[PDB]
Amino acid sequence: MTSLEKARELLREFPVVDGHNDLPWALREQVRYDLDARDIAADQSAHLHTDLARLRSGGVGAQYWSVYVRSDLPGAVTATLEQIDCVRRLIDRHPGELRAALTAADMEAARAEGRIASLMGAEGGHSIDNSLATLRALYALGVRYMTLTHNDNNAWADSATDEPGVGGLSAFGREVVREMNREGMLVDLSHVAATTMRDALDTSTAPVIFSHSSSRAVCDHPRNIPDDVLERLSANGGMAMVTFVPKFVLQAAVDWTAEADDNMRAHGFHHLDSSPEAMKVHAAFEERVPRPVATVSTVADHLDHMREVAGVDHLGIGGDYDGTPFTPDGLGDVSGYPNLIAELLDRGWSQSDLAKLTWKNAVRVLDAAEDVSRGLRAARGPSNATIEQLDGT
Numbered sequence: 557m558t559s560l561e562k563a564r565e566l567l568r569e570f571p572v573v574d575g576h577n578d579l580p581w582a583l584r585e586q587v588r589y590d591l592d593a594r595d596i597a598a599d600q601s602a603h604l605h606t607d608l609a610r611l612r613s614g615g616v617g618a619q620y621w622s623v624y625v626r627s628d629l630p631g632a633v634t635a636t637l638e639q640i641d642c643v644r645r646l647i648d649r650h651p652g653e654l655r656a657a658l659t660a661a662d663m664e665a666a667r668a669e670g671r672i673a674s675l676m677g678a679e680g681g682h683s684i685d686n687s688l689a690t691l692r693a694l695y696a697l698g699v700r701y702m703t704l705t706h707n708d709n710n711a712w713a714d715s716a717t718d719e720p721g722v723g724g725l726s727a728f729g730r731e732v733v734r735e736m737n738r739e740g741m742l743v744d745l746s747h748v749a750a751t752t753m754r755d756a757l758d759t760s761t762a763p764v765i766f767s768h769s770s771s772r773a774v775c776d777h778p779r780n781i782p783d784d785v786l787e788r789l790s791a792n793g794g795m796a797m798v799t800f801v802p803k804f805v806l807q808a809a810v811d812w813t814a815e816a817d818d819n820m821r822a823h824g825f826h827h828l829d830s831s832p833e834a835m836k837v838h839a840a841f842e843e844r845v846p847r848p849v850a851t852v853s854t855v856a857d858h859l860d861h862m863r864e865v866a867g868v869d870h871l872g873i874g875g876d877y878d879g880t881p882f883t884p885d886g887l888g889d890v891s892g893y894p895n896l897i898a899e900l901l902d903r904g905w906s907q908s909d910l911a912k913l914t915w916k917n918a919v920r921v922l923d924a925a926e927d928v929s930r931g932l933r934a935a936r937g938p939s940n941a942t943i944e945q946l947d948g949t
C-alpha cells in the first residue's frame with residue numbers, strides 16, 4: 557500500500573492526541589456560541605478548520621480543546637468559564653462522537669469505544685486572575701493544562717512575544733507551577749519566554765508540555781523551543797507538541813512576516829493594527845510580495861530535529877487548528893494529519909515511533925501528572941499564598 561494508506565492504518569490503531577485546537581474561540585468570535593450556526597455534525601469547511609467528519613478523517617482520537625481568552629480585555633475569568641461551557645456543550649451535543657476526558661484512563665476508554673477524548677487546556681495565566689483558588693476551580697471544571705502566558709507578559713511570567721518582565725517566573729509564578737503540580741494540571745510552556753521555560757523546568761516536579769510549539773533551531777522565532785530546552789525534556793519527562801503555524805515553521809514565512817510588520821511600521825501603523833487603512837497597506841505589501849506557503853515537509857523538518865534533540869518519547873502534535881488563519885499545504889484542516897504521518901514514514905520513522913508521537917507520549921505525560929499529584933496531595937494541603945505575599949506590593 558501507499559504511505560498514505562499505511563498512515564491511515566497506523567492512525568486507526570494509535571490516533572492523534574492533538575495538543576491545541578481553538579474551535580471554542582472560533583465559535584465565540586464567529587457566532588457567539590450559537591452552535592446550531594456552526595454545527596460540527598455537518599460540514600463546516602467554509603468557516604472552520606474543524607468539524608467531526610474531518611476530525612475522523614484526520615485520525616484525531618483525542619483533542620485538547622483550547623479555552624483561550626484575550627489577555628488584553630477585562631473579565632478573563634468570566635470569558636474562560638464561557639469557553640469551558642462551550643466545550644461542555646459540544647460534548648453534550650455530540651455523544652456519539654465525543655467523550656469528556658479528565659484522565660489518561662479516560663483517554664484510553666474513549667479510544668476503546670471509538671470516541672474522541674475531549675480535554676481542555678487554558679491558554680494563558682491571565683485566566684486565573686492571580687488567584688490560586690481560581691486555578692483550582694479551573695481544574696475542578698476540567699482544565700488539564702494551562703499555558704503560563706499568552707502573547708503578553710502577566711504579573712508572574714514572561715511571554716516570548718513581549719519584553720523581559722520578571723525575568724522568567726516570579727516567586728508567585730513558581731508558586732503557580734507548584735500548585736499546578738499538586739493539582740495535576742500540566743504546565744504548558746508554549747508562548748512563554750525561554751527564561752520562563754527554564755524557570756518552569758527548574759521548579760516543576762511533573763512532566764511539562766508545549767501544547768503548540770516547534771523548533772527554534774530549525775526556524776528562529778521566539779514562539780519556538782530552543783535546543784537547550786528540548787534537551788531537558790528527557791529528564792523532565794515532558795513533551796513538545798509540534799505546531800503547524802506557517803510563520804513559525806517556515807523560514808521564508810518568518811522572514812516575510814517580519815518584513816510585513818516592518819512595512820506596517822514604515823507607514824506609521826502598529827504591526828497589529830487592523831483598521832481599513834492599515835489593511836490597505838498590508839494588502840499592497842502582499843501584492844508585491846506574495847505570502848510564502850509551508851508544506852508537510854516543513855513540519856516534518858521540525859519533527860526530525862526535535863526527535864534528534866528531545867527524543868522520540870518527548871514529541872507530540874499540536875496543530876493550532878482554528879487558532880491561525882494560515883496553514884501548510886497538505887495540512888489545511890484537521891483532516892490533514894495522515895499526510896504528515898505518511899511523510900514521516902517516507903523519512904523512515906517506525907510504527908512504534910509514530911504511535912508515541914500520536915498517542916502514547918501524551919497519555920504517559922497526563923498519567924505522570926496524575927501520579928505526581930497523588931504524591932503532593934497526600935503530602936500537603938493546597939496553597940493559600942497571594943501574589944502580594946510572594947512578589948511584594
Ligand SMILES: CC(C)C[C@H](N)P(=O)(O)C[C@H](CCC(=O)O)C(=O)O
Nearest residue numbers: 578581624679768779801876879880
Ligand atoms: C486570538 C486567538 C485566535 C489566538 C490563538 N489562541 P493562538 O495563540 O493559538 C495562535 C497563535 C498563532 C497565530 C497568531 O499569531 O495569531 C499562537 O499560538 O502563537
Ligand SMILES: [Zn+2]
Nearest residue numbers: 679746747768
Ligand atoms: Zn497559542
Ligand SMILES: [Zn+2]
Nearest residue numbers: 578622624879
Ligand atoms: Zn490558541
